[PDB]
Amino acid sequence: RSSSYSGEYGSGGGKRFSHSGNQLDGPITALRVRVNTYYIVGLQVRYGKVWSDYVGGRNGDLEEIFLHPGESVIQVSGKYKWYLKKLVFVTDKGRYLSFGKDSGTSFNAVPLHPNTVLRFISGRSGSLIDAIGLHWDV
Ligand SMILES: OC[C@H]1O[C@H](O[C@@H]2[C@H](O)[C@@H](O)O[C@H](CO)[C@H]2O)[C@@H](O)[C@@H](O)[C@@H]1O
Ligand SMILES: [Cl-]
Ligand SMILES: [Cl-]
């Protein structure tokens, strides 16, 4: 078995969410992160050609980045307090896809098993992103 899970990074507020079902749509191809002055407000991930249902709140500006064909996320770092503040998605093409504010408790998630990549995310949300989890697999 090659699946592994990193998290949760954040606190216990909000309601749990998961993109477990979304991996049937395809590999991660794009990221949407709504950000304000202090926090990561919301998250959306594109699996193959299909965007997940938006999670989080509305009080922030939407940032968006598409992955290149064949580009996979192989490491995720970030920062949090009671809520998520920063995410950096490191890819196998050497890109560091950064969102949010450089402050708070830091974390650094890497996959446990050989040759695995980021397949989906989970976490907790409300008006903000309270917590995030990273799920790795072949
Ligand atoms: O995700 C953050 C937070 O969202 C919800 O609470 C909101 C916040 O406390 C704040 O923005 O004020 C709102 C109205 O006063 C309030 O709804 C909850 O889902 C909470 O559990 C969660 O931590
Ligand atoms: Cl850590
Ligand atoms: Cl760290």
Author numbering: 22 to 159
Task: List sentences from the manuscript.
O1 of the reducing mannose residue makes a hydrogen bond with the Ser148 O, thus stabilizing the reducing mannose outside the binding pocket.
Zymogen granule protein 16 (ZG16p)5 is a 16-kDa soluble protein, originally identified by screening a cDNA expression library of rat pancreas with a polyclonal antibody to purified rat zymogen granule membranes. The differing carbohydrate-binding modes are attained by a shallow mannose binding pocket and a basic amino acid patch on the protein surface.
